[PDB]
Structure formats: C-alpha cells, structure tokens
Amino acid sequence: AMAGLKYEDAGVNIEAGNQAVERMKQHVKKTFTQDVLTGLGSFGSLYSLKNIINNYDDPVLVQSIDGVGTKTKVAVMCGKFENLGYDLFSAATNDIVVMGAKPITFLDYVAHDKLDPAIMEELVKGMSKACAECGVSLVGGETAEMPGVYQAGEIDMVGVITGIVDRKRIINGENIKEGDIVFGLSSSGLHTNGYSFARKLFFDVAGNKHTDTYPELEGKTIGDVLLEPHINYTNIIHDFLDNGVDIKGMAHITGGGFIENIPRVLPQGLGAQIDKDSFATPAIFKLMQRIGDISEFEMYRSFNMGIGMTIIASQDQFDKMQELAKKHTNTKLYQIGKITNSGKVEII
Amino acid sequence: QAVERMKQHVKKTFTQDVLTGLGSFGSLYSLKNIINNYDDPVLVQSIDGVGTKTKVAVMCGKFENLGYDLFSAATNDIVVMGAKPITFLDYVAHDKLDPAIMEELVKGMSKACAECGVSLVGGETAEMPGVYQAGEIDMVGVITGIVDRKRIINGENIKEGDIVFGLSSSGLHTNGYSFARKLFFDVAGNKHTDTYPELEGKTIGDVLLEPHINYTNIIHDFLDNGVDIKGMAHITGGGFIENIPRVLPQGLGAQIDKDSFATPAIFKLMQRIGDISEFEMYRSFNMGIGMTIIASQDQFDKMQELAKKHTNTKLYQIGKITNSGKVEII
C-alpha cells in the first residue's frame, strides 16, 4: 500500500486454527510407541497387539474410566491449567495399577462451556507428558462445547485407561492373611477428590481468594496447594513388581479414605488397622481441619489424609520396597498398618 | 435395590470372555479368544459424548433412549474401519444425581451392548453441582474393538464410479440438537409436548428423542458375509459434505441423489420452521441417512439379501463417487 496510511488489519493478529491443532498433534505424537498405527481423524490412532501377544502367556484387558471432578472449577478460577492433564491421567490409571496391570493406551474427553484452544493446548500438553512418563500412548480424544450444559467457564475432563495384565498375575488380595502389613505411599494433597468441599470451605465460608496463604502453608497460596497434581503411582508400583516385590493387594485411596477403599481387597472376615501417626499429613488437610472446624474423625472418614496408595504385603517385603522407593522422588513409602481378623477397616 | 437392578442390566452384557473386576460394576476382559480368532489383532478405540441431545432429554424428562444414544454415538465411529466392538465403559456427570434416571440410562446402554455382543466392563458417575446448570447432565462413553490388521477399511481403494449406499437414520441421532432446541423451544416458544402437521400427532420431544441407530450388527453381517466394502462414513455433525470426504482419496468427490431415500418428518419440519434451503439442510443434517457405505455396484445384491433381517434400518443406493473433489447433492 502507499505510505502514510493506517494498517487496515492493525491490532488483529489472529492465528489460523490449524496452528494450535498442529502443536497439539506434536505433543500427542510424543506418546507413541512402536505399537501405534495411523487411526481415524486428526488425533486418532490404533494399537497393534502383536507385542502383547508375544510377551504375555494369557493377557487380560483391564480398563477404567474416571473424571477429574470439581478440581477443574478451582483450576478455572485460578486460571491455572498446567497440572490438570496430570490429574486426569493419574485419576484413571492408578485405578488399574492396583491389579498389576501395565497401562498401554489412553483416551480423553474434555467438555467446555466455551472451548478455548489455548486452554485445550495446555491440557493436551499435560496429558501427553503424563502418558509419556509411563509409556502410554494417547490414541484418541474428543471435545464438546456446550454452554447450555455447563455453568460459565466450567469444564469436565474424562479419561479412559486401558492396560494389560497376565491372568495369573492379577493382584486380587486373595492371598492376604492376618499379620500381613499395610504400606502406603504419600499423596500430594487432595488429589482428585473433595474439591467441592474445599472450594466451599475456603472461598465461600472463609472468604479467601486463591492467592491467600495461611501459616500451615508457609507462604504458598491456597490455589497452588490445592492444584498440586494427583500422583501417578504407575512407575513405582512397576518398579516394585519388576524387582520381585510380592504384592498381595493394593487400594487406591480416593473419596472415603482408608475405610471406604481398603475393604475391597480384603478376604472375607479380615480387617486392617491403620495407624494415623505413622505417616505425615499434608498441610492442606491440617489447614482445612482447623479453618472448617472439622472433627478429626470426619477428616479421616473423608480424605486420603496423606496416603494416596496402599500396598499389602508381608513384613519381609519392606526392605526391598524402601530401597526401591528411594529413587522415586514424587512419593514417600511408609509402613502404616497391618491386616487383622477384625472384619473391619479401622483408623487408630 | 436400584443398584441391584443396574447390576442385572450390566451382567446381561457379559460374554464368556468377561472376568470379575474392581468395585461393584468393574469387570475385566480376557483376550484369549481374540488371540485365537485373529491373525494380527489391532485394538481400536473411540471416545464420544451424546452431546446437546441430553438437554432435550432432561427437558422432556425422558431418558429411555439416551443410554442407547450414547452407545451408538461411540460404537458407530469404529465400525467404519471394520472393527468389531468388544467392550464399553461409560461416565455420567450430573448437577444432581437422581438414581431413577441413572437406572434408565444404564438400562439403555446395556440393551445396546447386549444386542451386539459388547460387554459393559465399567463406569463411573459424578455429581458436580457448581459445574452443571440445573438438572443438566453429560454422558461420555468409550468403545474398544478389534480389527485384523489386513482388514482395516480406510477408503484407500475407492475409485470413481463406485456406488454410495446408505442406511437410514431414525432422526437427528446425536448431532444438531443445539440448533433443534433453539429452533423449537427458544424461538417458536414450543413445549416438548407440542406437535406439528409433519408429525401427525407425535410430540416434538418424542420425535427428537428417537435413539441413534446402532449399525454394528448390519455392518458386520455385510463384512463377514463377503460384501467388499471399500469405505464407510458415519454421518454425524456436518452431514454428507463434512463426513464423506474424510474417507475419499484425494481428488474424488461424491454425488448424492437426494430423492433416493426417505427423509424423516423431523427434518422436513425443521426445514420449514427455520426456512432453511434444501441446499443448507443437506450440509448440516443427516437427512435420513446415518451411515454411508462405499462399494462397487455389484455388491448391492448381496447387501440387499443380507439387510433383510435387520429391521432397525433400511438400505438404499444413494449416489456415486465422482472426480469432482466435492460432495454434491442433486
């Protein structure tokens, strides 16, 4: 154009939609193993079973579907999305590793009041990295934009993990006996449960904003502490199993804490006793207990209270476990309790 | 009690390959028979939601067909490559959980699973009050299936002169409900119990809520019985023009004869009320065809013979593959 004139398009720099798509594709592709083949659509892949059939005597397909839950609402209010991909991935895959399954594929669905490609880019970055850390291929996904369904700015994240375990290696708790030990691996916080409650506690009743802190938090913001990611126990559990640790049973500690989650893996009539003083409780829990005037018993009935995964094995497995655990810096191993004849899970 | 009825619906989906899982509703799936019956098995998966149809279901208070919708929405997307569905999992999120509703959804999903041999191996519900608008829900489902490597159908062998066949839909299926809801209930100020001349006394709610048809059985009947299918396209949002090109080799196009198949009344109604050109209709809606199948003309005879037993859909010859590079309606 001739000199001395306004640029017509000045101030509008709007990147072609295909740019974000391509970046997401690059992140997803980083998750692919040799077993992946071209799938359907932009993000679709398939998965060859050839290697699985060769490496397993009697392979069984193990699957689980899970959402993040109201933690997303906290992420939205904080404008902090970078840990949610990890939250979702862990929420789903910890639920199959309790059986000794090796995760193979992942798919995700994210629904939005309004789909914002920048936010989606961050979720895909996180989910892809989470997958890549444990050797899982992200083979497909879907999005939905439904402002009439969702409250303003809200989202819902759902994911599905698929894994393989040899039939004879399924860890079911059948061999658990009185006198076996309960071990546990620390959580980072609330993980993926109890956020509706926490949000109301802090932001409704207490009147906080997410950038506030409390003495328990040593300057860390409530938002940052709440948004720490759900720990993925896949790698440490497989380190144990690959090194010959004889794991009799496991329980992923989610809503309802020890009492709700442990009984699932116990043979008829057997109990468990968990010593609550044998492990550290994350500051966020102690803080909620104080601010919300919640009784200690309700807290332990409700929340993981610092243990995200339990492992049941004989005492003589502890040395090998603790040796192996040292290298995994995202979680800590404790001996927290024991299997009894009590017919109940109790916290003491 | 409601949980026991749900467990019974879920159990009805179990094939011999199912093993006990984790939790009330969890199961596992043994691959032994897969490994024995396939040369080179490939695991094929897809995840999808029902979409905005849920809002109409909530408005009508009719959940009978929604669980079936969810299964079909997920499963049809993998049958286009020749995969045989094996397992299903579902996730339902609610503003406020109502167990009577959940039972109805589980009833529908299980029916769809059971009739095609898919085992429902797990699921989850979530109540998230600060997330959903009053009474609203979201439903997600994931299908897993198996295909032999050599038998993957991608459309790569499609050529000019191949025929486009289609299988009838029941209605909008799973797409276009945002438009439908706004057309009928925002603007025309209708209630879901209202009717229109095109509907002959059937309510707008009932016609909208007819279930997304499950094409699993007819497609595998075609495939297992010797129909040489070069490609398929599930007609979902974007109608023929958006969906068909995805399976067409570069430069190829399709011509669809609009008069060759019946269009359900609901589409004619929306066309009139919205004053939408016929041109626009075929670009935005399935217009009566939920699935397209591309094969040579000489496959029609076997297809028609095999289709007879399948009473939930009708087979039509709707068009042909061209060199136009575009999808055109004539």
Kind and range of the H or E run holding B125 = strand B119-127
Beta-carbon contacts of residue A279 (< 8 Å; ≥ 6 apart): A184, A186, A306, A307, A334, A336
Q: Tell which of A64, A77, A137, A200 to mutate to test the B interface (max B CBs under 10 Å).
A: A64
- Resolved by: X-ray
Q: Distance, in angstroms, between B35 CA and closest chain A CA?
A: 7
Enumerate the residues of chain A whose CB falls inside 8 A of the CB of residue B152.
Answer: 46
What are the distances in angstroms from CA A218 to CA A214, A306, B257, B259? 7, 18, 71, 72
A35 is in an annotated binding site: no
CA quadruple A201, A207, A213, A215: dihedral positive or negative? negative
Q: How far is CA A183 from CA A232, A300, A307, A325, in A?
A: 17, 17, 9, 12
CB spacing of A44 vs B46 below 8 angstroms = yes
Tell me the chain B residues in contact with residue A107 when contact means C-beta distances shorter than 8 Å: 45-47, 142
User: Count of alpha carbons within 13 Å of A159, Cβ hemisphere only?
Assistant: 33
Q: Between chains, do B55 and A144 touch, taking CB under 8 Å as contact?
A: no
Please tell me if residue A139 touches chain B, with a CB cutoff of 8 Å.
Answer: yes
Domains and CATH numbers, chain A: 1-171 (3.30.1330.10), 172-348 (3.90.650.10)
CA dist list (Å): B193 to A137, B57, B207, B208, B310: 47, 12, 10, 11, 31
B255 CA to chain A: closest CA distance, Å? 23
| CB-based contact A243:A324 (threshold 8 Å) | yes
Contacts of B299 (CB under 8 A, 6+ apart): B163, B227, B228, B229
Residue B4 marked as a ligand binder = no
* Residue in chain B nearest A61 by alpha carbon: B29
Q: Which residues pair with A105 in a beta bridge?
A: A137, A162
A109 contacts chain B (CB < 8 A): yes
The CA radius of gyration of chain B, in Å to the nearest whole number, is: 20
Helix H or strand E encompassing B218: helix B216-224
Q: Kind and range of the H or E element at B145?
A: strand B137-148
CB contact under 8 A, A107 and B47: yes
Q: Residue A61: how many CB atoms within 10 A of its CB?
A: 25
Show residues of chain A in contact with B124, CB under 8 Å: 65-67
Q: Is B156 exposed, middle or buried (0-12, 13-18, 19+ CB in 10 A)?
A: exposed
Query: What are the residues facing B306 on neighbouring strands?
Result: none
Contact predicate B165/B317, CB 8 Å = yes
Judge residue B154's burial from the number of C-beta atoms within 10 Å of its C-beta, 0-12 exposed, 13-18 middle, 19 or more buried. Answer: middle
User: What residues of chain B, 246 to 265, have a C-beta less than 8 Å from chain A?
Assistant: 246
Q: What is the resolution of this structure in A?
A: 1.8
